[PDB]
Amino acid sequence: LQVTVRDAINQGMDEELERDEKVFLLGEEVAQYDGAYKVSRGLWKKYGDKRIIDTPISEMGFAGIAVGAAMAGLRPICEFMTFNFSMQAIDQVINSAAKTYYMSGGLQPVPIVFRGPNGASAGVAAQHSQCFAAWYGHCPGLKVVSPWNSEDAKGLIKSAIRDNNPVVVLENELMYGVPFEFPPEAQSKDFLIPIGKAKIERQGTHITVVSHSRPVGHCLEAAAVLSKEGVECEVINMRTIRPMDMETIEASVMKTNHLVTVEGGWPQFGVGAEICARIMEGPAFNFLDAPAVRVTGADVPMPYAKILEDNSIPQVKDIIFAIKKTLNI
Amino acid sequence: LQVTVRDAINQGMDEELERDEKVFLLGEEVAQYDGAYKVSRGLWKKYGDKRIIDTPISEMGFAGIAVGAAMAGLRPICEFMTFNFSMQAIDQVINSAAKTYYMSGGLQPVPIVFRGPNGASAGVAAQHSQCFAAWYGHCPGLKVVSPWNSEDAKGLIKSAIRDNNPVVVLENELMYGVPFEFPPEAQSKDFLIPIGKAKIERQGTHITVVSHSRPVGHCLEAAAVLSKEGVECEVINMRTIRPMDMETIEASVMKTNHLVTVEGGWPQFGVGAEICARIMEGPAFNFLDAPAVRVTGADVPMPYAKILEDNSIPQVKDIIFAIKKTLNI
Amino acid sequence: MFANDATFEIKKCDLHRLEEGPPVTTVLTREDGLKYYRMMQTVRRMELKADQLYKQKIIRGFCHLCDGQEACCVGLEAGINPTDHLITAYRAHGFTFTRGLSVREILAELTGRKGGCAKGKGGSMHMYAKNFYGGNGIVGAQVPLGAGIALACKYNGKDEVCLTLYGDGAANQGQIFEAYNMAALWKLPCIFICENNRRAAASTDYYKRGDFIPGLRVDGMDILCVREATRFAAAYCRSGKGPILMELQTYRYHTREEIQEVRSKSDPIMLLKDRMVNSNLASVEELKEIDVEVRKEIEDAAQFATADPEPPLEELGYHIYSSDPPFEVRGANQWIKFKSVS
Amino acid sequence: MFANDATFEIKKCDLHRLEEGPPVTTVLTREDGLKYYRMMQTVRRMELKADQLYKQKIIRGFCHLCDGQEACCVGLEAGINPTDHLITAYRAHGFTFTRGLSVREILAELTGRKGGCAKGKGGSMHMYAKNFYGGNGIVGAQVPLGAGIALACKYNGKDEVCLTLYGDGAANQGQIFEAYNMAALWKLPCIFICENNRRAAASTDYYKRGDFIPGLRVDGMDILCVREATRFAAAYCRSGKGPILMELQTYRYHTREEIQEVRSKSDPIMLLKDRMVNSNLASVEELKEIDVEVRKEIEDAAQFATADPEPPLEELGYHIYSSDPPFEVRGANQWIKFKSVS
Ligand SMILES: [K+]
Ligand SMILES: [K+]
């Protein structure tokens, strides 16, 4: 079987909904319209108005409702059309969901999942192309994952729903319709991916290439272009923005002696910043034979023109140029 | 002469408001009440309803209204009681203000200023304690400054009003009543502190200590403790968060061969991370005789009890422990 | 000899989109209103103790007192069950108590001690109780929250309602109007409650602000109709009619002299006292004794709440996530680690 | 020989919180009605080409059409001066044109080319002109923006007003009410126009959502009611009476058959066309030939817009900040530097 990321997620939500009635889905065009991206297809037809609720366009309000339900024992999946629209509810995620377990002295858990597509799309211009990995990644009391292929998206969305605290799931629109071999063990309904654990997608020995979400594909592309040249990369897919698996990245660095991180977000204070700062501060540092470089999104609000847009997210050459730079080959 | 940080800012707005009738202040309790923290004391009394506008508690709304006025051509100083509250308006700031000049291909500028206390206070617990330096500084089209002392505060607030783009000013409330020596050149109503430049508040030759806002003060305390054992720290006051003055930090690291960043808010994907990442990418990586480290706020939402909170914000002890750990002394 | 119970008039509420509102007459059973006294009185003496603990500086940051409003928080608990839901903003001392918490754990949380109800982590604004989603400090955020709790009710279908409160100051929070909308739209069993205790709002007719949502305006100095209203709203919601707004009119004590005329013309406790008495429902000396009793409960608590040691610093990272294995949390620099357990 | 002017009945507005509304009778001059037709036709033809360029993929990303709504932007621009302000959400091709920009620059920004009105940086949602504060991608974000443009108006006293538009999807945004309140509160010359082109709201009487702000329900397929109720609302605001809601009832063309019976019995170009014809203000040939001039207009622009070169790569970093010295911007990796000039 080959299932697309969009279908993977659907499988996850469906199975979890079936498994547990405390679990429901609210958001914009999730129900009748079948998903703004066809992601929640057929769920309404199968679970009804109690469990798949279409919401008005009132983010600050409906995020806040999901959190209320959650606080009261329900297990809501809260969807934002794109995460750009989450800027309106961001107060609700940070102030009501994230910090509450801690402020109540452990009395009040908030089992809520926030999902939606994140980051660059295609010519949706400056207001619908922001990445939020970095900002959410920053907050105590929140867990933040960023899935790549089918396998990830189904595993992670499933573990997020099962998790007893607020988990923020950063999907990606371009990944939606991309298909992938879907191993029989993943077609199961107990298929779970532990939050907090990266995956080596490609064994290698010359350099470590850490990345998350879509641009992980461009890394594998780079890695294949580059082995035609005797250069092996260990490509790593974080999966998890917070609590990110730093052990795995160091272990790979101790073998490769080089590090390039690759991410679609803005550069400063991004996911690449926290990874290096971590390499330096940890025991992996001394193994470095050359400074760790970052490849990220260009530091601008995202333009519209196709050519300008293309040089605003990282292209497979840009990655190759930083890999070559680092190995001074 | 001695002026508290509170007064330095109040002068600044007073000189600006006089100089230009386009300029106006608004936020909650800014007018009749003399300010939530007496920062606008007496301004309403002097300039009136028209120029100093008390707002209801409607952040997403008035931030909106401010940005609007700025686009129509006024020069609004929009105050947030504290920046935790701006999370409800964060979208007007990022999406209406910060990306507009660019989306319009230079047609529509947005001369707004956003200011208020930021980061930790004293016993306000989790929802009032948050630092935002890293979240704002992450966004192209914004300028983000974080004053420490009186002289900083009056310069950067005048600079930002006079600036033509959206500029977020992160004040610190525990700094408000701290008095500082006010050089006569600062009382001048031509005082301007240019955005994007750091200040060296203490020459030293052993280690570089970089920091912003209130904890710059505590690095000066740690540096006096230390040169009693002949360790000379170079203390850099960042002043601007975006666009930071990385040159200066590089110059100094080439001299001292060591680096410590002390910031107020949470560790991960935080301000330190970026200086650290930069430091590795830049020229000064090879002058670094030991890994640069980060001294931060503890990674939890902010707790209430005095002892717990006292251990959640970096204390002079921890700056010193870190420096000594770096200097391997 | 004594009265078993008595009948009283309460003010009749203004109505928005309702034909009949709550009765203008009620029956306080001497035995019940003995418990409404002792409660109100308890809240008053606690809030006064806190205030003094705060003026002393043993309480820090925020300290929002609810005195003058004791008729609201006791009145509310009198017209709903133990099993219904209540969420308010940051003036949440009265409620925390009327919802189950001892004065000791409320006081101890204020003074930041291990014996606080949240082990010193939370302090004045973040107290949580059984079916109380507490106080929240982001003005307005509690309202869509409570609409959620109401969603939760309908969704379990066990006839529970949910009282979502906010202050005339928060009455202009955009999210509040988003929450009135979906509330109406899905007919949530949510009672929106505006504690209006008197430039900010172009319409100070809060009970009508919900527009399509019906409302009533109550006199919150009077525990009797507050109860009545609440029975009236609660019942409205249970029977599927949907959401409803209640403006509770009141006056917090926390010049000093308009404060003074309000207190001697209509303290909630005084009013109840002149009613219990001037209808033989209880004795001034009877009441004078429970005054002595509460004085002792407060004294017991303030004693506990200033004698109990701080929280241990090895518990700073506790309770970030529920239901996970223990892990470490980075403190001030990378060599400081704190254990976090669920 | 043609009449100079005629007199028609327009539908009567519903009112809310208003005494008397705009007149039910108006005067259309010949030479005017000729101008409103060429504008409606241009906006119609424009969107048709956009839509066609957009199934062909020259236009990427969003592409919201307003064909069907031409009575709205032309009639509104009929009721106001060029010195007044207008701001809308993302459905802004019609308004960009009525507010000054040429079909050339609009199509060229749609196809993201250097000749486009925002140099191809903006795309379909963000276009700006003289007193046009664009379209904004974020639902309802522009209503508090509008309230602010309105505040600036009062602030310079030039008796200019602000048309702040939003559709019925955005009519439940929390921000919207936050702006109703301030607008009334500061008596801002802000006209809050709700484009209601027809579940989500608990109340679909939109001209009344303002609550304490007076509103009128207008018919948005009649270019004449729009112009009328606009001159009326402009009057009201300029007379210093503060804000007003105006629901424009309309219909966007983009079952597909409900779309049909709404076009024969009320394209808004067909209505004006029948009026002019039936009252000797213009000939059917006159109009048929203005179409031919409009169709050739749009054709030449579209041609320019598909031929025009993309912007140069080296300007990807321009226009981040205004009035600053030049500086560099980091690209996909550190070795990529882009110059940024204001
Ligand atoms: K969950
Ligand atoms: K400015």
Swiss-Prot record, chains A, B:
UniProt-annotated location(s): Mitochondrion matrix
What SMART domains would the database entry show? Transket_pyr
Catalytic reactions on record: N(6)-[(R)-lipoyl]-L-lysyl-[protein] + pyruvate + H(+) = N(6)-[(R)-S(8)-acetyldihydrolipoyl]-L-lysyl-[protein] + CO2
What is the enzyme's class at the highest EC level?
A: oxidoreductase
Q: What is the effect of changing I329A?
A: Reduces pyruvate decarboxylase and multienzyme pyruvate dehydrogenase complex activity. Does not affect interaction with DLAT
Q: Note the site residues: Important for interaction with DLAT.
A: D289
> Modified residue Phosphotyrosine is at which positions?
Y37
Role according to the record? The pyruvate dehydrogenase complex catalyzes the overall conversion of pyruvate to acetyl-CoA and CO(2), and thereby links the glycolytic pathway to the tricarboxylic cycle.
Per its UniProt record, what Pfam families does this chain match? Transket_pyr (PF02779), Transketolase_C (PF02780)
* Co-factor requirement: thiamine diphosphate
GO annotations of cellular component type:
mitochondrial matrix; mitochondrion; nucleoplasm; nucleus; pyruvate dehydrogenase complex
Q: What does the entry give for GO biological process? A: glucose metabolic process; pyruvate decarboxylation to acetyl-CoA; tricarboxylic acid cycle
Ligand binding (K(+)): I112, A160, I161, D163, N165
What species was this sequence derived from? Homo sapiens
Modified residue annotations for N6-acetyllysine: K324
Give EC number(s), comma-separated.
Answer: 1.2.4.1
- What's this protein's name? Pyruvate dehydrogenase E1 component subunit beta, mitochondrial
Disease in which the protein is involved = Pyruvate dehydrogenase E1-beta deficiency: An enzymatic defect causing primary lactic acidosis in children. It is associated with a broad clinical spectrum ranging from fatal lactic acidosis in the newborn to chronic neurologic dysfunction with structural abnormalities in the central nervous system without systemic acidosis.
Q: Does the keyword Cell wall biogenesis/degradation apply?
A: no
UniProtKB/Swiss-Prot annotation, chains C, D:
User: Does Transcription appear among the keywords?
Assistant: no
Tissues expressed in? Ubiquitous.
List the catalysed reactions.
Answer: N(6)-[(R)-lipoyl]-L-lysyl-[protein] + pyruvate + H(+) = N(6)-[(R)-S(8)-acetyldihydrolipoyl]-L-lysyl-[protein] + CO2
Entry's EC annotation: 1.2.4.1
Description of activity control? Pyruvate dehydrogenase activity is inhibited by phosphorylation of PDHA1; it is reactivated by dephosphorylation.
Record-level GO BP terms? glucose metabolic process; pyruvate decarboxylation to acetyl-CoA; tricarboxylic acid cycle
* Post-translational changes noted in the entry: Acetylation alters the phosphorylation pattern. Deacetylated by SIRT3.
Specify the enzyme's EC class, one word.
oxidoreductase
Keywords assigned: Acetylation, Carbohydrate metabolism, Disease variant, Glucose metabolism, Leigh syndrome, Magnesium, Metal-binding, Mitochondrion, Oxidoreductase, Phosphoprotein, Primary mitochondrial disease, Pyruvate, Thiamine pyrophosphate, Transit peptide, Tricarboxylic acid cycle
Cellular localization per UniProt: Mitochondrion matrix
Q: Where does thiamine diphosphate bind?
A: Y90, R91, G137, V139, D168, G169, A170, N197
Predominant subcellular localization, coarse grouping: mitochondrion
GO molecular function term, any single one: metal ion binding
PTM annotation (N6-acetyllysine): residues? K35, K208, K265, K273, K288
The entry marks the following residues as binding pyruvate, namely H64, Y90, R91, A129, G137, V139, D168, G169, A170, N197
Q: Which InterPro entries match?
A: DH_E1, PDH_E1_Alpha_Subunit, Pyrv_DH_E1_asu_subgrp-y, THDP-binding
Q: Where does Mg(2+) bind?
A: D168, N197
N6-succinyllysine, modified sites: K35, K208, K241, K265, K337
- Cofactor entry: thiamine diphosphate; Mg(2+)
Looking at the UniProt record for this protein, which Gene Ontology cellular component terms does it annotate, in alphabetical order?
mitochondrial matrix; mitochondrion; nucleolus; nucleus; pyruvate dehydrogenase complex
Q: Give the protein's function.
A: The pyruvate dehydrogenase complex catalyzes the overall conversion of pyruvate to acetyl-CoA and CO(2), and thereby links the glycolytic pathway to the tricarboxylic cycle.
PANTHER family from the UniProt entry: PYRUVATE DEHYDROGENASE E1 COMPONENT SUBUNIT ALPHA, SOMATIC FORM, MITOCHONDRIAL, PYRUVATE DEHYDROGENASE E1 COMPONENT, ALPHA SUBUNIT BACTERIAL AND ORGANELLAR
Q: How does it assemble?
A: Heterotetramer of two PDHA1 and two PDHB subunits. The heterotetramer interacts with DLAT, and is part of the multimeric pyruvate dehydrogenase complex that contains multiple copies of pyruvate dehydrogenase (E1), dihydrolipoamide acetyltransferase (DLAT, E2) and lipoamide dehydrogenase (DLD, E3). These subunits are bound to an inner core composed of about 48 DLAT and 12 PDHX molecules.
Task: Give the protein name, as stated in the record.
Answer: Pyruvate dehydrogenase E1 component subunit alpha, somatic form, mitochondrial
Species per Swiss-Prot/TrEMBL record: Homo sapiens
